[PDB]
């Protein structure tokens, strides 16, 4: 009756014309109004195969977010190695807003409603929707910020667990807030996390993960190398680019007081959006503060395991399309 297929999707949001925050404006131009009354049909007697690691929707969302960052986070200067271009450096105000993805005529989205679907394989509980849930396009590393949560209990997602080159995304079942501040009166900054909630969630994630490695001892370590965007929790807050040391986050011995991360805001960055360093203007004055919900983590498992104990996991930036995978995982476009 239908077949797997790719196609051109359109976006939908609650962006308002009066609102001048950059994403919101981009949405009033690129997107349409969110469905006032969504319709989700679930039918018994059907089975479908899903593969989130090979979902074209990820590529499309990727192109949009690249488009969004090209007209909103236009930098003061670009060093693309082949050239160095100067250009306006507009002050940036943005908060991501949820964006819904929808299908054109003659296509449709399938939604997997298995409460413990790990991301690959056949699905039993299948439904049909014309649009995804509202997804916030948070570009971040190490930590997945402001995403959806597991309905039942923590879930480990990966294309091949064994394959150490396959990205691991942990999908928490209960989010933990991260408070980031830069006082006024310059590049210094800090983050705050409740040690108790966090560490509890670590106990739980390590037990589930271990559950997937034949009960062998699981240990965490800081990144082994690489660019600053990867080795630190990196994200864009109120137009500023934060880079926080997470060394402190993965502290083996306490497994509680509220732990606080040292962060810095940078003007020179490696664009994720492609290649080259971008130079933004100096950090504006005034106290700057982002409070986000940690809902996921990206990890890379160390190679050359050898003796059974001590799998070593490093929070891993991997590829940003993985941020989109972490939200798009349960959907697929099929062609009627």
């Amino acid at each position, epitope marked *: 009756v239908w077949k797997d297929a790719d196609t051109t999707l359109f976006c939908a949001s609650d962006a308002k014309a009066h609102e001048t925050e950059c994403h919101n404006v981009w949405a009033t131009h690129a997107c349409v109004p969110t469905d006032p009354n969504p319709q989700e049909i679930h039918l018994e007697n059907v089975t479908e195969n899903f593969n989130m690691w090979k979902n074209n929707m990820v590529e499309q969302m990727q192109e949009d977010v690249i488009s969004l960052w090209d007209q909103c986070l236009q930098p003061c200067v670009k060093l693309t*190695g082949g050239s160095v271009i100067k250009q306006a450096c507009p002050k940036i105000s943005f908060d991501p807003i949820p964006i819904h993805y929808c299908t054109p005529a003659g296509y449709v989205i399938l939604k997997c409603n298995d409460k413990n679907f790990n991301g690959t394989g056949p699905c039993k509980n299948v439904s049909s929707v014309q649009c995804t849930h509202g997804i916030k396009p948070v570009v971040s590393t190490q930590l997945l910020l402001n995403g959806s949560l597991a309905e039942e209990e923590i879930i480990i997602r990966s294309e*091949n667990l*064994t*394959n*150490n*080159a396959k990205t691991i995304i942990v999908h928490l079942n209960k989010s933990v807030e991260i408070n980031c501040t830069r006082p006024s009166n310059i590049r210094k900054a800090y983050c705050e996390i409740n040690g108790t909630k966090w560490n509890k969630v670590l106990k739980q994630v390590t037990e589930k993960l271990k559950e997937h490695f034949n009960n062998k001892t699981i240990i965490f370590q800081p*990144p*082994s*190398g*690489g*660019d600053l*965007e*990867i080795t630190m929790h990196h994200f864009n807050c109120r137009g500023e680019f934060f880079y926080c040391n997470t060394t402190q986050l993965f502290n083996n011995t306490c497994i509680n007081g509220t732990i606080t991360l040292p962060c810095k805001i940078k003007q020179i960055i490696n664009m994720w959006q492609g*290649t080259g360093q971008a130079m933004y203007a100096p950090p504006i004055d005034g106290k700057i503060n982002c409070v986000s919900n940690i809902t996921g983590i990206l990890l*890379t*498992r*160390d*190679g*050359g*395991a*050898n003796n059974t104990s*001590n799998e*070593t996991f*490093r929070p*891993g*930036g*991997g590829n940003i399309k993985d941020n989109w995978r972490s939200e798009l995982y349960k959907y697929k476009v099929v062609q009627i």
Partner: antibody
Amino acid sequence: VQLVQSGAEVKKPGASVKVSCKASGYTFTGYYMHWVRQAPGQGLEWMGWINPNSGGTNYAQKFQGRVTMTRDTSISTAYMELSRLRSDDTAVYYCARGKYCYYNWDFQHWGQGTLVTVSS
Amino acid sequence: VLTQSPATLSLSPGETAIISCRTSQSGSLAWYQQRPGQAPRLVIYSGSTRAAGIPDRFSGSRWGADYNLSISNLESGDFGVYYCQQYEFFGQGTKVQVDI
């Protein structure tokens, strides 16, 4: 596709070594770069990989703490530095890339190799 | 780990060589050939699939943990040492040499 490594090296124990690997004929940033060595009387031994766009790395665990992988995208080159050399680090060091298509392990392309002799 | 056997193989041209490899983990197993003084060249992947420029003389077959690489009708280019591979792990190698 071509992969060209720097030439042979002789070092004293405790010294460090830096091997280069120049890639051409493909999008350099597009594919993980692995390193694999082969010491005499030893089988082939994988050391680690780097993700070129990121500069991110994974290392074979026995190699933690003494191996450094980096790259210079401006010249499509990967670098492997091995510090605090021991005599049983005497080996041919190779850089390798995944098969064109990807699985990323099937090692379709190899550098010509760089010989490193470590001896007092 | 990866156990490759036999350790050594002394054969005449024309004959067929049978190398075996034991894994304990399932997944893609590959075979490499390394000629004296050259970089290894990929010979087989997925346990059974030949690569580019690899002639019919080379063939792989598989049974459970056991993996076989079979090289039929040996010729001068074929001699060297062979490795089985699974993800980041390699076998110890099998040196196949000529004794006319």
